[PDB]
Design a protein around this ligand. Sequence first.
Ligand SMILES: CC(C)C[C@H](N)C(=O)O
Ligand code: NA
Ligand code: NA
Length: 502
Amino acid sequence: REHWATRLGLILAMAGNAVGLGNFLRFPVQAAENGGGAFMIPYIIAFLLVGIPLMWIEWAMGRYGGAQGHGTTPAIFYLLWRNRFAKILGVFGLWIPLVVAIYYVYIESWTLGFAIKFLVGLVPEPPTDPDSILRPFKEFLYSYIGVPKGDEPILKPSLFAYIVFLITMFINVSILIRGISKGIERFAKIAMPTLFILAVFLVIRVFLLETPNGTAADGLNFLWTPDFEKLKDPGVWIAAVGQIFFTLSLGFGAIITYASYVRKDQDIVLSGLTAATLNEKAEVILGGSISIPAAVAFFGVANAVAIAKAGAFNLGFITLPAIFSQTAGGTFLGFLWFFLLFFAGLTSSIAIMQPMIAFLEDELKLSRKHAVLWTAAIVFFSAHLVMFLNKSLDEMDFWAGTIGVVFFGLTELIIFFWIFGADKAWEEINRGGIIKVPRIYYYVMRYITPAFLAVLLVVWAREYIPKIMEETHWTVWITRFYIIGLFLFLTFLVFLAERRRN
Ligand SMILES: CC(C)C[C@H](N)C(=O)O
Ligand code: NA
Ligand code: NA
């Protein structure tokens, strides 16, 4: 089996997995919608009671499986629990990352396309009226991905966007095809440093922004000022947990796959802890100190929150660059912003494609080259669904990147810390660890975490089961139909892999 060359390379590879579009895009929005400081309390709690224990659990399961030549859940679940149903459940460890990757890579191609156009200097040129400053960039984004005037189902992506998406796919392949140590590890040792330093630079510059309407400092205050009146709102907790799962790449089966390349005897405790800690630093300190504080600076808190509630891409692809355009060298600043997003997204996109590749290599015994090329083909082909179908991206993000990851996180924990045995799991987690997990986390993993996730899922289902059936748009049923097709497709490959073994 292939392994990580150095401990450092391992750490930065995992950090590149977590730290991504979720930090500079999803987080600012989630925190803004949930009342800044009021969102932070549940967020931290969710990080302690959910993020860390699951992180360690996934690392353990990964290395455990990897030692026997299996990096994906279909096999690993079976190793932890003997049952056909264990394999069927493990199919999500492939379905989830694949579905998410389909649209994730596309968003990543956006940041790239933007990074290019902003570098060359081809951008809209605003003239004191907020709308007259934002409108040009709204039209700019809409022209790029091809957004309809009214609410129309079909998207018309510009040739440039499509070509950029091809390039993005190429870059992803060029990295993945070189292997774990030579391809992913090498890139991580470069991208991450660049990323952190670009992020750092952007946080400085942004913090310097101050206008008659507000300051970046007002934004930092808003984000870090505690509010206890929102603690009784379940929605805040649900959003916090969802963000923790997404940002830490938990429930995507990515962490597990990466961990399967860690040598049986190498530490996963301190490594895992360090990776997660880096992500949070990149999330709360970097991610939350760029977008929000800038919006608040120019438009004020109220408007900033309104803009955040407007959409997820509205703050990242429209508001921020529009704000930069009003400053000296704002065009170049916008470039660094999209270059940062691109490197963050690229480091994550490769991570959610690897689980599929690892399955083909491990279970179907395909060469790395073939495994990568076929994975890219599937993603690229499926991407047309997200590219040309409005609301398809949202549907995938929801079913896979929201519900799926939580459901899968609960499943893997139940299989590992319950069926497989709590003590055995604990012993497996701490084995070889440079430091040992606090004893208390034993009771967190076995009782607290699973219960909280279960309650969450129950609450969700109660609200969603009626809404699903009554949804007017056909694009979602097409998306649903197709991803269900993808699931069946993957189950069939597992069947073949199972048959080859015999
Ligand atoms: C799906 C995951 C790879 C997402 C990543 N953890 C992020 O924060 O963007
Ligand atoms: Na990343
Ligand atoms: Na992240």
